[PDB]
Design a protein that fits this description.
By secondary structure, this protein is mostly beta strands. The protein is 11% helix and 55% strand. The structure holds retinal. The site of retinal has 15 residues, from strand 3, strand 4 and strand 8.
């Protein structure tokens, strides 16, 4: 399904370290940053998304409209400029972040009562699974 609305609680986080290392996030930050408790709050109205990610480490909010390119300056992350675009491939929501890193972006989809998130950068893939709260 394309409906990703809801409050989503992390139940699995695979290779977040590899993803972060591929982003060149500094070592001390990576040691903290990985949290197995993470809440993703998604408000979806038509093509407008408001996404908020919360953990005890840091909170990451982004708003976007599907099919509208938007520049990002990833200050809270690896500190880079990218050109972001979020589109649908079937029922998979795909973000491509064009810039220095190849294969940078994410894919998000709903399968049953679960939200799946694949974060990619370079040859690294991080896979996260969330249960609807
Ligand atoms: C639709 C889902 C989206 C837009 C999620 C994107 C999430 C991130 C870019 C999250 C990054 C981080 C954490 C979840 C932990 C805190 C540190 C970050 C920034 C690496």
């Amino acid at each position: 399904t394309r409906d990703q609305n809801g409050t989503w609680e992390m139940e699995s986080n695979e290779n977040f370290e590899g993803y972060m290392k591929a982003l060149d996030i500094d070592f001390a930050t990576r040691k903290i940053a990985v949290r197995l408790t993470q809440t993703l709050v998604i408000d979806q109205d038509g093509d407008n998304f408001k996404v908020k990610t919360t953990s005890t480490f840091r909170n990451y909010d982004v708003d976007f409209t599907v099919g509208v390119e938007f520049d990002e300056y990833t200050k809270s992350l690896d500190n880079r400029h990218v050109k972001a675009l979020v589109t649908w491939e079937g029922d998979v929501l795909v973000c491509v972040q064009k810039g220095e890193k190849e294969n940078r972006g994410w894919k998000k989809w709903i399968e049953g009562d679960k939200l799946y998130l694949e974060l990619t950068c370079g040859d690294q893939v991080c896979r996260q699974v969330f249960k609807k709260k």
